[PDB]
Amino acid sequence: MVLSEGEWQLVLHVWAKVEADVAGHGQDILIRLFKSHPETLEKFDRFKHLKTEAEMKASEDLKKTGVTVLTALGAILKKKGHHEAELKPLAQSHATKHKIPIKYLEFISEAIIHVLHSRHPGNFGADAQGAMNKALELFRKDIAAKYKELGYQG
Numbered sequence: 001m002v003l004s005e006g007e008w009q010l011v012l013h014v015w016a017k018v019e020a021d022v023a024g025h026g027q028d029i030l031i032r033l034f035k036s037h038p039e040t041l042e043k044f045d046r047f048k049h050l051k052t053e054a055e056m057k058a059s060e061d062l063k064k065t066g067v068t069v070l071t072a073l074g075a076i077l078k079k080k081g082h083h084e085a086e087l088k089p090l091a092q093s094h095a096t097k098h099k100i101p102i103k104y105l106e107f108i109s110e111a112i113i114h115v116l117h118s119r120h121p122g123n124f125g126a127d128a129q130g131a132m133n134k135a136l137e138l139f140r141k142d143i144a145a146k147y148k149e150l151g152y153q154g
């Protein structure tokens with residue numbers, strides 16, 4: 001697939017607002033993912049034991065992780081589709097080391113779209129959400145193809 005420059009603009013315009021607070025958005029998104037799909041918390045051996053949202057809010061490990069996730073995603077979106085190199089190492093560790101199914105990447109994409117919609121309503125109207133969903137679908141499709149080459153397709 002291929003996004004038009006206007007769609008990338010909508011994606012990078014709302015991403016520039018997320019970057020004013022990467023750690024807060026990281027927390028919100030991971031907590032949204034774990035409350036919606038609790039089985040995903042099991043993949044994180046570091047803080048798998050957290051039982052409540054309050055615990056999750058108070059975990060420094062969860063917040064650091066959230067910042068790592070968003071910083072790597074932001075670096076991929078800024079490429080505007082030319083992300084082959086950034087995707088390689090990512091696809092390898094999530095397919096071989098962590099074992100994250102494509103389904104989980106769909107779940108976090110939905111958590112990203114839910115948080116942006118709540119926090120940024122004025123910059124996340126319907127066209128901007130369609131462009132963000134396209135950009136995340138592109139990311140999932142290229143990662144899924146890399147998973148296949150690596151022998152995981154999951």
Ligand code: HEM
Pocket residue numbers: 040041043044045046065068069070072073089090093094098100104105108
């Ligand atoms: C937008 C999608 C994602 C991006 C950009 C992303 C990126 C990263 C990055 C950069 C790291 C550190 C380096 C590495 O291990 O590769 C990481 C580690 C990890 N990611 Fe992901 N991730 C994403 C989705 C997920 C999902 C959905 C899960 C789990 C349901 C997951 C589980 C993990 C785990 C278990 C680690 C190790 C955490 C720790 O112990 O350090 N990731 N991820």
